Amino acid sequence: WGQPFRLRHVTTGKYLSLMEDKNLLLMDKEKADVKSTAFTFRSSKEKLDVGVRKEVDGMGTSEIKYGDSVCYIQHVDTGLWLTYQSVDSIQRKAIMHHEGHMDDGISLSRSQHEESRTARVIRSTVFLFNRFIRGLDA
Amino acid sequence: EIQFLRTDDEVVLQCTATIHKEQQKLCLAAEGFGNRLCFL
Numbered sequence: 001w002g003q004p005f006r007l008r009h010v011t012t013g014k015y016l017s018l019m020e021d022k023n024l025l026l027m028d029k030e031k032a033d034v035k036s037t038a039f040t041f042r043s044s045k046e047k048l049d050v051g052v053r054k055e056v057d058g059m060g061t062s063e064i065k066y067g068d069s070v071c072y073i074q075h076v077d078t079g080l081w082l083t084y085q086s087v088d089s090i091q092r093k094a095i096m097h098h099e100g101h102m103d104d105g106i107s108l109s110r111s112q113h114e115e116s117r118t119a120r121v122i123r124s125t126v127f128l129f130n131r132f133i134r135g136l137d138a
Numbered sequence: 139e140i141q142f143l144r145t146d147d148e149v150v151l152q153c154t155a156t157i158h159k160e161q162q163k164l165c166l167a168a169e170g171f172g173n174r175l176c177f178l
Contacts, residue, residue: 121171
């Protein structure tokens with residue numbers, strides 16, 4: 001809980017980032033900074049900070065659990081809790097607010113290895129083929 | 139306590155290159171689907 005990390009979109013190769021205009025927008029690898037691209041999970045919605053902890057060397061302790069556990073996404077620098085726009089497939093837009101809503105808990109499901117490998121083959125192929133189409137156009 | 143490497147462990151191979159007096163850590167990488175060659 002509270003560990004900084006990046007979130008990458010598997011089939012597009014871009015990282016979840018917060019723009020200066022306080023909006024989530026996938027932005028590229030070559031410009032993906034820790035300040036823009038860093039998120040954390042916290043047990044609940046309370047504002048007490050996790051603080052500075054000594055980073056272990058190994059597994060550590062199994063804390064965040066798939067499905068059963070409930071997590072909350074948080075940008076590291078700004079403290080803006082991640083919520084829904086609540087306006088309207090639903091296409092409910094996702095932004096971050098100071099307090100968000102009551103039902104801002106997000107659970108996790110682990111993708112199987114076959115799905116994870118296929119989702120990377122798709123990205124590795126859509127790039128080479130887009131390179132080929134552009135060469136043919138030239 | 140010192141840790142030892144064993145089989146079935148997941149590791150990355152790191153090499154250090156000092157270009158124009160600037161240390162840069164590089165990891166052995168490869169994209170095994172469609173490109174058998176390895177890069178850094």
